[PDB]
């Protein structure tokens, strides 16, 4: 082992937040085998990348320019302000002009110069029409001039990458736990399940005994299923009831061998279904967890009416249960089912997984996948085949085959969900894990978020940290020296702030009070940090194109309400930046932020859905990245206050909410009457957007301290970590021009945007349902695969015409008109004072 290679792994360990070489919690070599197995797809991906295009990371799209962006263009003309030094020359450009074509027309008014966005590491390069660049469309939407600054293309050198018919049986020896309470007198038994895709194939149980520090049986549990019949990805799921503890063991190993021998397995406890329950990983807490000793000792045309029945089944929502009758119909006419890509999940749920002959015919059916291979890619459908309900390698691989076709743009929309879907994988090395490795290594933006996404899990999931660490390691070994330096700097900043937060909060404390002593203790520690020492600059984890510089220590403070996070402000590292404005980041500690990260991601999905449906509901996507254990970073949105603070501006610590105050605030903050009309329209659209989005996700009923607004009328939600559908209070309606059933032209405008936006999401029901199911399974702890998931269906009005749905949503608007300020008042009494 090279002393420099040893140093390189020590670097990687700190970048990951876990040692992949650490063997304290294994019973096989699956992790090491995956570490080995991933060398090839990494090497194949580093070898195939354009060093130049990788260095500049052009962020683009194939999707058409939306209607709301074409109308903003005046006469097939786009203005680009190209900067040199003091000088800046404006240029009229056609939307279809490629970056080379634009450079030459400027060179007219030696040829190794590139166009770069002012204030960021964003390059308008490669052969793409200017309209198809994501920064360009972003500017068009929200109104800023397109400022470029002609410079030298980055040096790719900096990106250099370091050089048998027997029945199956198990003997439950006993269960051991170091300590327990005294007591009380309780019963205890072991349940052994043979699972595959959450489907219980076979089940046996031990004789119940009293719950003491040690319990033993030494009883064999003979199962009906034969050894030859065990499918790959099948699990032995061992559970203890009084459900208190669980643990899993893959029956078929990674080398396709049956599991055999003595097994002491440290179990996970339940804190009273979810992705944590499927884990092959063992509880690393050997001195405090419940254990289990086990023993294993044993190589792999339709008639008219039925066609109607088949098609009716196929038509149902993914949360619709299949009867034996549906399963027998789907299976018998499997070659007719195959002619419906949308029938694949329901068909694959009708497979006799615990019967080799069927699994083989499934593989026979799958070999001729003409329909599936030719089918127009469906993320929703593709993802249904990647959840908990599918344990088969081949079924999961066909979903990954369709994802191969997804462009960087879309991979960036569903990246988190795709990283979460690795929790539903039977084995560490999988088609999906390799897909994420390939994409990450291929593009710099995808690679950055993959790093953070994987790091959020490694830091706070004992159940999948081991698996995720091997994927991060594999990625880190191929991103390049430059990215490894960026990642070191970001990690340095995070670890140093963590310490500052772990010291500042070690002298207070939560509840009433912000203290001048604490703000003083804060600024002191940052003054000590900046010299010396911390990184000079760093890429903002939620906005990698941005580079943060020195701290504005005086602008930094400690925030107001109840779990004490840092309001940091940084100078920008790019001196070619347009504005002198700071980079504001909230460094929060004490809370897991993965759920907030998830909510915001699904919102970003909804904007892209609305984009495809030609709509723009002006949602405000602000950065929010979970950066380690119970720690993270939130983007500070400029000129924005909470709704509640607008109520305490006129009024105070009540309670007594006034109708006129929001419209009052907006005119006070709008410089011109022209700007106030723009702010009133931006409000109407953004209010509508959050009314539908929050309603669909079932999180509409929030306090106004959790709803924020920009001085430009942009409404947005924060802090996601009597009842109403959403928040459409009298203060919002007053901005629209109404007061207690007094319909206005802007409230009429509003209702229509709402209904257009609602029907637009309804056209993507199955996608939203699958995204919502995956979120509850991988995001939050234990949730019901039946009522909890079922809300989304009801909210989306599944099985209704557009007119009934149009009505449904208008009724919801009226429940908000009926309750007015009531719900907000009740929130104010519960949250503010018990
Ligand atoms: C400086 C001073 C006077 O305290 C201000 C008084 C008013 N507050 C409002 C406030 C009060 C509380 C706030 N809390 C959060 C926040 C949070 F604290 C925890 C999780 C989160 N998820 C999403 C946002 C978020 N995020 C805020 N943002 C600031 C604006 O940009 C988006 C993120 C946030 N803002 C801002 C600071």
Curated annotation (Swiss-Prot):
<dbReference type="GO" id="GO:0046854">
    <property type="term" value="P:phosphatidylinositol phosphate biosynthetic process"/>
</dbReference>
<feature type="domain" description="PI3K/PI4K catalytic">
    <location>
        <begin position="552"/>
        <end position="821"/>
    </location>
</feature>
<comment type="subunit">
    <text>Heterodimer of a catalytic subunit PIK3CG and a PIK3R5 or PIK3R6 regulatory subunit. Interacts with GRK2 through the PIK helical domain. Interaction with GRK2 is required for targeting to agonist-occupied receptor. Interacts with PDE3B; regulates PDE3B activity and thereby cAMP levels in cells. Interacts with TPM2. Interacts with EPHA8; regulates integrin-mediated cell adhesion to substrate. Interacts with HRAS; the interaction is required for membrane recruitment and beta-gamma G protein dimer-dependent activation of the PI3K gamma complex PIK3CG:PIK3R6.</text>
</comment>
<keyword id="KW-0472">Membrane</keyword>
<dbReference type="GO" id="GO:0004672">
    <property type="term" value="F:protein kinase activity"/>
</dbReference>
<dbReference type="GO" id="GO:0036092">
    <property type="term" value="P:phosphatidylinositol-3-phosphate biosynthetic process"/>
</dbReference>
<dbReference type="GO" id="GO:0071320">
    <property type="term" value="P:cellular response to cAMP"/>
</dbReference>
<comment type="function">
    <text>Phosphoinositide-3-kinase (PI3K) that phosphorylates PtdIns(4,5)P2 (Phosphatidylinositol 4,5-bisphosphate) to generate phosphatidylinositol 3,4,5-trisphosphate (PIP3). PIP3 plays a key role by recruiting PH domain-containing proteins to the membrane, including AKT1 and PDPK1, activating signaling cascades involved in cell growth, survival, proliferation, motility and morphology. Links G-protein coupled receptor activation to PIP3 production. Involved in immune, inflammatory and allergic responses. Modulates leukocyte chemotaxis to inflammatory sites and in response to chemoattractant agents.</text>
</comment>
<dbReference type="GO" id="GO:0042110">
    <property type="term" value="P:T cell activation"/>
</dbReference>
<dbReference type="InterPro" id="IPR000403">
    <property type="entry name" value="PI3/4_kinase_cat_dom"/>
</dbReference>
<dbReference type="GO" id="GO:1903169">
    <property type="term" value="P:regulation of calcium ion transmembrane transport"/>
</dbReference>
<dbReference type="GO" id="GO:0006897">
    <property type="term" value="P:endocytosis"/>
</dbReference>
<dbReference type="GO" id="GO:0002250">
    <property type="term" value="P:adaptive immune response"/>
</dbReference>
<dbReference type="GO" id="GO:0010897">
    <property type="term" value="P:negative regulation of triglyceride catabolic process"/>
</dbReference>
<dbReference type="GO" id="GO:0003376">
    <property type="term" value="P:sphingosine-1-phosphate receptor signaling pathway"/>
</dbReference>
<feature type="domain" description="PI3K-RBD">
    <location>
        <begin position="75"/>
        <end position="152"/>
    </location>
</feature>
<feature type="binding site">
    <location>
        <begin position="584"/>
        <end position="593"/>
    </location>
    <ligand>
        <name>ATP</name>
    </ligand>
</feature>
<dbReference type="GO" id="GO:0030593">
    <property type="term" value="P:neutrophil chemotaxis"/>
</dbReference>
<protein>
    <recommendedName>
        <fullName>Phosphatidylinositol 4,5-bisphosphate 3-kinase catalytic subunit gamma isoform</fullName>
        <ecNumber>2.7.1.137</ecNumber>
        <ecNumber>2.7.1.153</ecNumber>
        <ecNumber>2.7.1.154</ecNumber>
        <ecNumber>2.7.11.1</ecNumber>
    </recommendedName>
</protein>
<dbReference type="GO" id="GO:0070527">
    <property type="term" value="P:platelet aggregation"/>
</dbReference>
<dbReference type="GO" id="GO:0002679">
    <property type="term" value="P:respiratory burst involved in defense response"/>
</dbReference>
<dbReference type="GO" id="GO:0007204">
    <property type="term" value="P:positive regulation of cytosolic calcium ion concentration"/>
</dbReference>
<dbReference type="Pfam" id="PF00792">
    <property type="entry name" value="PI3K_C2"/>
</dbReference>
<dbReference type="GO" id="GO:0002407">
    <property type="term" value="P:dendritic cell chemotaxis"/>
</dbReference>
<dbReference type="Pfam" id="PF00454">
    <property type="entry name" value="PI3_PI4_kinase"/>
</dbReference>
<keyword id="KW-1003">Cell membrane</keyword>
<dbReference type="GO" id="GO:0043303">
    <property type="term" value="P:mast cell degranulation"/>
</dbReference>
<keyword id="KW-0547">Nucleotide-binding</keyword>
<dbReference type="InterPro" id="IPR045580">
    <property type="entry name" value="PIK3CG_ABD"/>
</dbReference>
<dbReference type="GO" id="GO:0035005">
    <property type="term" value="F:1-phosphatidylinositol-4-phosphate 3-kinase activity"/>
</dbReference>
<keyword id="KW-0391">Immunity</keyword>
<dbReference type="InterPro" id="IPR003113">
    <property type="entry name" value="PI3K_ABD"/>
</dbReference>
<dbReference type="GO" id="GO:0051897">
    <property type="term" value="P:positive regulation of phosphatidylinositol 3-kinase/protein kinase B signal transduction"/>
</dbReference>
<comment type="pathway">
    <text>Phospholipid metabolism; phosphatidylinositol phosphate biosynthesis.</text>
</comment>
<dbReference type="GO" id="GO:0072672">
    <property type="term" value="P:neutrophil extravasation"/>
</dbReference>
<dbReference type="GO" id="GO:0046875">
    <property type="term" value="F:ephrin receptor binding"/>
</dbReference>
<dbReference type="GO" id="GO:0005829">
    <property type="term" value="C:cytosol"/>
</dbReference>
<dbReference type="GO" id="GO:0043406">
    <property type="term" value="P:positive regulation of MAP kinase activity"/>
</dbReference>
<keyword id="KW-0418">Kinase</keyword>
<dbReference type="InterPro" id="IPR000341">
    <property type="entry name" value="PI3K_Ras-bd_dom"/>
</dbReference>
<dbReference type="GO" id="GO:0010818">
    <property type="term" value="P:T cell chemotaxis"/>
</dbReference>
<dbReference type="InterPro" id="IPR002420">
    <property type="entry name" value="PI3K-type_C2_dom"/>
</dbReference>
